[PDB]
Amino acid sequence: GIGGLDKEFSDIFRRAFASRVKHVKGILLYGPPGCGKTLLARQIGKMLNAREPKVVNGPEILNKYVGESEANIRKLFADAEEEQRRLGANSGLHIIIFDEIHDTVVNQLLSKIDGVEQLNNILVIGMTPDEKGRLQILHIHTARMADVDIKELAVETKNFSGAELEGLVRAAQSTAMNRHIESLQVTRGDFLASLENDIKPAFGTNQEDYASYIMNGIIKWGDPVTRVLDDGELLVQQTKNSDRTPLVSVLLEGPPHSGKTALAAKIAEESNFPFIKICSPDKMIGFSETAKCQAMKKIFDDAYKSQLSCVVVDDIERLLDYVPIGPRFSNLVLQALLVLLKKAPPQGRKLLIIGTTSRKDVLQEMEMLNAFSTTIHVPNIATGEQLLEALELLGNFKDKERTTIAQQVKGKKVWIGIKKLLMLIEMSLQMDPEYRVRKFLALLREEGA
Amino acid sequence: NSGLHIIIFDEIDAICKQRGSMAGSTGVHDTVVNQLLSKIDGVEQLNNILVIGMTNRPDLIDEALLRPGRLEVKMEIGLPDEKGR
Amino acid sequence: MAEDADMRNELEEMQRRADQLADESLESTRRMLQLVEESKDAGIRTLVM
Numbered sequence A: 001g002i003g004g005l006d007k008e009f010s011d012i013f014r015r016a017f018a019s020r021v022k023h024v025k026g027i028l029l030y031g032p033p034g035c036g037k038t039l040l041a042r043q044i045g046k047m048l049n050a051r052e053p054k055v056v057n058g059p060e061i062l063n064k065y066v067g068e069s070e071a072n073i074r075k076l077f078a079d080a081e082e083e084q085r086r087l088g089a090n091s092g093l094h095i096i097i098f099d100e101i102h103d104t105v106v107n108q109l110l111s112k113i114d115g116v117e118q119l120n121n122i123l124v125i126g127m128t129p130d131e132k133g134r135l136q137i138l139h140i141h142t143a144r145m146a147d148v149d150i151k152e153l154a155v156e157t158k159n160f161s162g163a164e165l166e167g168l169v170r171a172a173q174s175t176a177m178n179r180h181i182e183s184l185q186v187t188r189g190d191f192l193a194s195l196e197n198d199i200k201p202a203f204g205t206n207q208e209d210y211a212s213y214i215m216n217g218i219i220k221w222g223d224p225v226t227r228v229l230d231d232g233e234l235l236v237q238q239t240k241n242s243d244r245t246p247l248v249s250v251l252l253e254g255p256p257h258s259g260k261t262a263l264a265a266k267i268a269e270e271s272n273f274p275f276i277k278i279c280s281p282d283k284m285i286g287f288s289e290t291a292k293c294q295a296m297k298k299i300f301d302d303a304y305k306s307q308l309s310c311v312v313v314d315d316i317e318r319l320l321d322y323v324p325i326g327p328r329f330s331n332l333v334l335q336a337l338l339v340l341l342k343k344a345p346p347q348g349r350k351l352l353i354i355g356t357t358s359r360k361d362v363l364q365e366m367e368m369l370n371a372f373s374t375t376i377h378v379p380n381i382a383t384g385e386q387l388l389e390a391l392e393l394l395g396n397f398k399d400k401e402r403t404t405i406a407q408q409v410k411g412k413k414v415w416i417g418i419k420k421l422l423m424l425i426e427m428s429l430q431m432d433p434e435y436r437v438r439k440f441l442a443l444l445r446e447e448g449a
Numbered sequence B: 001n002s003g004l005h006i007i008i009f010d011e012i013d014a015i016c017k018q019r020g021s022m023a024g025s026t027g028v029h030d031t032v033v034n035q036l037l038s039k040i041d042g043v044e045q046l047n048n049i050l051v052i053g054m055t056n057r058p059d060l061i062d063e064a065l066l067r068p069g070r071l072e073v074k075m076e077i078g079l080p081d082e083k084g085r
Numbered sequence C: 001m002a003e004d005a006d007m008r009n010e011l012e013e014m015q016r017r018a019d020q021l022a023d024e025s026l027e028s029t030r031r032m033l034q035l036v037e038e039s040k041d042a043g044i045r046t047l048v049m
Ligand SMILES: Nc1ncnc2c1ncn2[C@@H]1O[C@H](COP(=O)(O)OP(=O)(O)OP(=O)(O)O)[C@@H](O)[C@H]1O
Pocket: A213, A214, A215, A216, A217, A218, A219, A220, A221, A225, A255, A256, A257, A258, A259, A260, A261, A262, A263, A315, A358, A418, A419
């Protein structure tokens, strides 16, 4: 009985056991915490032999230093070698497992396996949620002792794992017996904010933070929004049925303070893939160029090893470390990125790489644009119609005061992007109610309409 | 099963290197976690007694021995706030 | 490399009984030096008389 890991369980038993039923000397597994490591170590041993001895080895193994583990490590194997040498012909298999792995044991240990004697016919394996398994953790540990739900503290698992969850449950008595002490009526075992935070430290690899890049869901203020989105999502769809374009390169660009970074996250989330990942300079701050490129490899190879996935790279003029005053940048990072865009996926895999650009002209000058394909202009707001419709979608202003700015429809013409505007309404509101709208227009004019 | 019997083992920093791998080549008994580790949970779990610890710099010790079940509890006192002080 | 590590390490004293108990055997060997000679003393003078 194994939750998940069947494809990995499939291949692992054949190559070891299918051959025997030169033979491999040993197999080793690397697994993350919370994987049910010990149960798997039990099961593979059980499956091997009916009653083939299942031997366990301690974490402390090199105890008894006076002069023992040099023997006692050796003796346990030696007994297995002893049994082997006693009767080699009619087929002897002995099992020892050493869980959770200096001078002497390195050469001795390995030597024991292949030294002087053939040493064959034995194997040793080292390993370094299952919410139903976690339910067993309840019904063995919790049953030992308005109750918790049958399932809540098993599905609230993400933050923790049962292997560490053994504190609040022990304290769970104290949760209402701590009367600073005649006895309050016996308790129910009540669970109340006894979920993770009493003892929260644990390992679950959160690493999300994807939503943060988009703080506001994008609002449709205009035909251009639907334009950009449908023009992009037809691409992400045609990859699915694609042939001879496993990579697809797109560069979408607009002027600054026009949110296109969350926008790309929007188009990528909407078309749901196995894998998504986001390359943010925010993450890699203060890194050497050769570390930065390495980072891009490390994510990008993760995307390859999925069957297919899109990824995003944002704000690359900063990723490139560009400055105009005289041009300087890291060249190798650029060239790396550029070769990715022409790098094929291995046999069948396919991906969509997209990228965001404040300024096009610099890169057009750097001849990186041809590697990109089928690019997308995201405009700034041109017109007050679109403006009024935008704040209508949001609803910052009351319609009455909204009249006042409405008084001008193409009284002036606007170059504005959404990000500065969205921050600008906030200061406008911050000022006294007579002058909120008074100042909003003032600043809309401050940037020259 | 009277468990009034407790000890202060202070300054765990010194007695233990996390697995003993720290400081490279060291005496075999320069660090024994293994006996006292084995003492509490190794031979059998002991429910009669409580061990206490003080470390000014925990992070040296923490990864190996503060694995849950050896100690699943870990606590930190910060300095007082204005009313605390 | 450019590596210089020059290091030291400390000693493990083999349990050499680690108690004074050695004395009692040493007391027996005292007495066999001590209590033996007067046998000869009185022996030679017993032989004189
Ligand atoms: N419909 C929309 N169009 C554009 N931006 C929007 C829209 N709705 C919300 N936003 C906001 O725009 C912001 C864009 O942030 P982003 O990282 O794209 O900045 P940016 O525009 O790329 O900045 P710059 O373009 O100057 O580098 C987001 O915080 C998001 O909340």
